[PDB]
Design a binder for this molecule. Structure first.
Ligand SMILES: [Cl-]
Ligand SMILES: [Cl-]
Length: 164
């Protein structure tokens, strides 16, 4: 199991522009197109992202290029971030994947404000951090996903992903 497998699991795959649970415009494997309401807009973006006149639809290949690009970006993001880096560095491999999952999902900005859990993570207070993580808009908005991630942080294993 790895980060790609993980995220593919959590984000699915769609060749069509679609709204996200947050109503926003996405495509592929969780590729955020735009925080605004114009399909025309998202569409523009799509085209720009792909470098061709897509018309709202892309190839698997395409989805994956974005995906590739997106994991890369998350990682760098983390690595450059002053609040993130220390956590990351302190963690084990599985747990790192979980971090990257969150940043992907919600952005480095978003994650960097999980200030408390971050500390707890850093101090390897796995159960407390999990509790903490759970008191979040994030959790309430996408419970099941949140749970998998949270577990991962909790256990340092891939169990929550095994079987699906
Ligand atoms: Cl892009
Ligand atoms: Cl969910």
């Amino acid at each position: 199991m790895n980060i790609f497998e993980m995220l593919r699991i959590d984000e699915g795959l769609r060749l069509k522009i679609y709204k996200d649970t947050e109503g926003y415009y996405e495509i592929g494997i969780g590729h955020l197109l735009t925080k605004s309401p114009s399909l025309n807009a998202a569409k523009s973006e799509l085209d720009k992202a792909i470098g061709r006149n897509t018309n709202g639809v892309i190839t698997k290949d395409e989805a994956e290029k974005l995906f590739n690009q997106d994991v890369d970006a998350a990682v760098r993001g983390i690595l450059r971030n002053a609040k993130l880096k220390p956590v990351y560095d302190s963690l084990d491999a599985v747990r790192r994947a979980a971090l990257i999952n969150m940043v992907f999902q919600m952005g480095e900005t978003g994650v960097a404000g999980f200030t408390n859990s971050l500390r707890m993570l850093q101090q390897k207070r796995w159960d407390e951090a999990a509790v903490n993580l759970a008191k979040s808009r994030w959790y309430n908005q996408t419970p099941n996903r949140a749970k998998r991630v949270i577990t991962t942080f909790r256990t340092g294993t891939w169990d929550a992903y095994k079987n699906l």
